[PDB]
Subunit: 203 residues, 10 copies
């Protein structure tokens, strides 16, 4: 006889490639940790110290609301969460199918979930291009230092100053590089899994 | 002989359907995580930057206390916590009953807790309609931008400005869509479990 | 032969009743989670926006130090932590005794720690009445809206305004109801365990 | 045949006494949790609301930098983290030695790491007296309410007010009592282990 | 027959030395915990209480943006996260290779991953010297107390005061000592593993 | 022989009636003295303490410039000066003609300038009705206490408060009564001089 | 022959008694000069430095408008100007009658205007009692130091401070004494002129 | 015999024409009195209420100094004083010559100072055209309402508001009309004196 | 025959000595003119710019009221007015007696009012010593620069600064010297008039 | 017979030259009038609008007290008053001597006070050079625009701005020119009187 906690691990550590195993480590310690630990402190006083040259109440609220409809900390969070989602559905499906197969019963006999891996890789790859295009079209590459605001109740043209315009642009480049490097890790894995699956098919 | 840590998972991963396994994954990574990580920073300076057009001390406190008796961040937290509660009582009951059955002893012999799943699904479904109706009757769909306040000690009619009226209304739509999508996942599982239980009953 | 990771669970899931397993689930998802996630944001600007009608430096500090000697957020935290303490000593004792009994060796033979459960239930029950009485005698049921302060260096009688006097009183009722409901869960379990232990004793 | 996940627990739950098992439970839920959850909110506006009687820029920074060179929140953190360190080295050593002994192979045969427990107890005991003496010589027992400051660029003698001088002194007593109670738990365990080891040694 | 949850630990607990096991304990409880728990509160009001001697709006933002282009809290976080990265790739590689070796099958037969440990140690050692040199060339050893700023729109020379210049310099020394002590732990392990590998090679 | 300083006085003290002599005394000690000594102090802080409910620079100047285009202190001065002008031309003409008549030479022989007195009385009488009508149509009878102002750059409707609205209205009544009483003094003199001149004309 | 510039002086210097000549000197250098030179500077910042304990605009105006409806500087000026008026009508009547009597012609022959002096003295005496009674009933004897104000838009009871409450009360006593001393100078002259006129009348 | 206080008046009231006697009366009661009594109160807070849109000290001083180098109240004073000067030298010369002629002694014999009157009229006429041209080239006809200021230390372009821009422009027209009317009074007198002097010269 | 306007001047310019004629010229152009023209501008902002180190309303009023109960500008005015009073009573008495003596009639016959001059000189001399002693005992010789104030509602000891402490002390010396010089002018005249009157008295 | 009011003028208008009569006219209408009417308004806010770059109370008073120990308005007043003093003593002496000479009695017989005119001219000339030298050594020719101040309690070097630095320097030039022109009028009169007196002296 054999146990079952073990068999539940060989099945999971036989359908994930080494590249996909290292992608999971790289894009959760350098991507999901920097956003939480180093992103929140930087973007805490974005409105508190967004200083405008006015004294009329309500002008600084309207000017900041026009300046940044949606912050890019929230955009980073949503983009990073929605990429880890295809990797959880497949993990839950593998555990649901593998543990429901040993209950009935019959040099192991690990099932082959290789067709369900290429689809998840394709969806994950397609989910990064759209979020990269939206990121480029929404925020650009570097943060500005000044903002002209003319909305009421402000009279004339008011000038407002952005807080921390340099460090915020230094974190943008780091996150852009991390995302670009992680995008090619799923492209070097798909073109290998596809090339391997057809090879192991005599006919 | 066989172990019983594998038996304690096969029992649990035989009473939960694939739809129910997928609902658990979706409504904790896109619902319970966005509320904590992305909801708290947005609603931090709701009173600090709630600027009113007055100079008399105590008017800004009174006006804000009438503007928002209960914030919708707390409402989101309470609504999301009370939906995961029926899913924990059933999980604890399954573990209490399963491990108390192998102690006495006698191609497995997994117990069938299918009657205790429909009831938990019904309670969970009924707990969402009430919280949706209350949400619609309390906060609406979009956030306002201005507030007229006439309570004492303010003299006349004072105007106050809401902080971040646009991003707050963008997060409401995302959470509304997530809740609406999760409500139909428990409705597509109940009408399948009920239809399956009667099928597997010759008489 | 049999394992011991399994034997270490039946020993633990044979000395805890269903009511005691359900109390553990309820009073950490609705009590220890609301305090941490929904209590900290509410009580963050209690002194920052405790506005008094004065201009002399140091009057607002003195007045606030007399208004609230100890906050009830810390009271809630200490009261909730000290109730989970009797449940941890018993858990650690059960694991210490159970794993030291299978080392020597000889239809299982699970030990009976039923006498050590009633004592922990009694201590837990006695620890709630004292904290309820202290809570009633210290903070009451609802939060006030204004405070008169006459301490030096303030001249005359100064009036100060409490921040968020309505939502703070709405959370008080929720926590009071949760505590009252959890107090009767340990009373319906003790009067059942005591009545069962004497029944299973012919003589 | 037998497993070795259980064998890795008998070894660990045979070298730690009951007093040492309950010390870990007590001085982690009442010491490391109150510091994190109840200490951070109290000491968040120590400088923001350290109000001095001056209008010259830079005087309030200089006065506060002389009032508190190092805060006692960080002192509590460092003192509590350096006491849990001897308990982790011994735990890692026990697992390193135990799992390297069953690989070679030969009513169990649990190894006896009793000599490596008294040394860790002695180091832990010696690490508390020094931190208690430093705590007494640095911060005293109660928090003050006022501070006289004469450093430049302030002219004359300025008076500054401490924020929350009462609650801060109420938390000090609780933490002092917790530390004093935990110090005698390691003294009642050492004088028992030493007395037991010599007893089980005929010669 | 034998399990494989046990075989998955000896494989991991036979390729890591005692020095490497104690290094992991040391520079994660005294390095990654002090940065998070004790570093964030200190560096929270670095810009809020960076007081400059001016009244023109926008001067305090410009002066602070030149004072600190990048904070050293973020530098500490990035430096500490990039050193734990080589230790995770090796860990995941060991688990990927070990569990893929028992599936095929044939006094244990644990594989020897001793060659893949020296390279990871070398990379980890090389990653510390660069970050130490950059730390020296960027921030120095102690924090200043004043800053002269002449950038527009400020007129003349303005003087600004740094918040908490003493405690910030006390945490610098603690972290410098921790890093210096951890650097020699990987140097005492490499020159031992290298000297041992050649010894166990007759030819 | 006789002198001519004396003859220069009988000529002047024979063409002015008793009513016209008392009018000069009354409307120079109660009219031209109250305006200078009691009017200037009252109207000194009319703009300095004209408080509006706004904080935007330039709104208080614009609102005051529309509230009072021309002050009534200046109106009182101009009206009181232009009434004393007809009385000076006649006085200078009498002295020019009288001293140019005794140079050539021949119970005195005082010349009769009775025709040149009725014309000056008529002009003086006609100069009061126009200034009374203008005063009634411009300022009214009493001073207001509040002013609504909506001119730019003020946003919305602003309320401004008039300084000393009661005493300013108490001086208005005194000056109105003085002017009304002085107007009938020139009407009781003209209808007497006209009735006397025709009587002393047999033919 | 004789001149008439001289005859115009004996006529005036034979109808005014020594007491009446001295009264004009006294209550014109110590009464009409102290009011102008020493009264205006004291009452210049009566409203500018009338400090009230409020921040709402418009409260300090309405409070001062109720504190002092009419100032006593204006009252002093009006009272002092209305007493010198009876002394000017008699003076101009004497010159009008005297210069119109020498034109027609016949040890001088100065006319006797003794009957027209008693009536002017009586009117002057009667004009002082009324203004003394009004002064007593309006302003009292000493100036206050504080004022309670409850008029809207002020909230609650506000306390305001009077500027220069001591010097203003020192000038009041000086002016009261001057007026009281001047009142008895016209009473010692009337009871002498009346007693002399009847004496020089044999029949 | 005759006196000479009279002879000193016939001499003076025989060399001044009726037009010249009337000009003297008009341009000191409507010109020299309005400037002093009505011009000083208007131009008292020209700098106090010259509000600029800036917060940097020293900008409001330089902006006002550039706005008005020399005020037109001082210009009015100097222009009006320098026109009365030619009328005083001639008056002093007539008195010096007339009283030095009767000392030596011989139907009066009044001297003829007609040649010294045309020259003074010519100088007075020439002194008005230059001051009118300078007034036109310096201040214009109406007062502005706003001023743009860019001098250092002000940053950018600042806008400042003029106090009382309407009443100040109403006084300008009154003074311009008075000056224009007085200029033609000296032109209607010169062309008459010149035409009369040549007529009374047979040869 | 002779006139009596001249006779009214011989009488007055025969009872006043040359020293008494020059005293009137000196102590009216250098004493009564400097006080009015140069004293009022200096003492105009004595309270407006009496800056105290406090922020509580009402403290600066009571502190200034205690500082200067009576100003020395008013003291100078009252002291200088009360010295010119004895010189006016004698002047009015001389004109009253001289014009009443020529009416009755009989190398002139000027009356001798020499006994009424020594008495007025004695009273004037006695009126200066008292005012000098009071001036010395009240204000001293030089003005202070700082004032400590502890009256309520001020808390502690407040420091206030006097405006223009140097120029005010420069005017004090000038006025002291003028008064001291004028005091000896009336002493050099009395000891000469007394010595002359007894000489012109044979018996 | 002759009068004496006429004799009192020829005596006075025979000892004053035409140049001396013209100097009197010029240096009271262009010197004593511009100082009073045009000098007081300019120097009214010299301290109110003397803006320094500081916030510490008491620094602006100390800095202004060192900037201008004595103002030049008071210097102008004192210098102009002390020059008219020699012209009043001579005038009073001429009237004292002339009216005391006709009382005793004997083509007039006017006395010759020519020796007492040169002495007064010499004293007046000598009183101008000293005040010109002091004026040059004290204030210079033009007014500054900025002032550096380092006196305590000001910290560092403070910059202060002078109010109206341009118009104040324009009035200085006008007054300098007036004084310089008036100084040569007394020099062209003395060198003529001295040359004439010696001519009219045969021996």
């Amino acid at each position: 006889g054999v146990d079952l906690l073990g068999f539940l691990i060989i099945t999971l550590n036989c359908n994930v490639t080494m590249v996909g195993k290292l992608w999971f480590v790289l894009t959760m310690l350098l991507r999901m940790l920097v956003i939480v630990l180093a992103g929140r402190p930087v973007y805490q006083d974005e409105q508190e110290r967004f200083v405008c040259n006015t004294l009329q109440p309500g002008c600084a609220n309207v000017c900041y609301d026009v300046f940044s409809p949606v912050s890019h900390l929230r955009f980073w969070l949503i983009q990073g969460v929605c990429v880890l989602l295809p990797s959880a559905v497949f993990s839950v499906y593998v555990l649901h199918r593998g543990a429901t197969l040993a209950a009935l019963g019959p040099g192991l006999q690990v099932p082959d979930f290789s067709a369900g891996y290429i689809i998840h890789l394709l969806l994950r790859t397609l989910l990064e291009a759209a979020f990269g295009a939206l990121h480029y079209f929404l925020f650009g590459f570097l943060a500005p230092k000044k903002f002209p605001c003319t909305r009421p109740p402000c009279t004339g043209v008011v000038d407002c100053y952005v807080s921390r315009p340099t460090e915020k642009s230094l974190l943008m480049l780091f996150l852009w590089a991390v995302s670009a490097l992680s995008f090619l890790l799923g492209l070097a894995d798909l073109v290998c899994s596809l090339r391997r699956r057809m090879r192991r098919r005599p006919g």
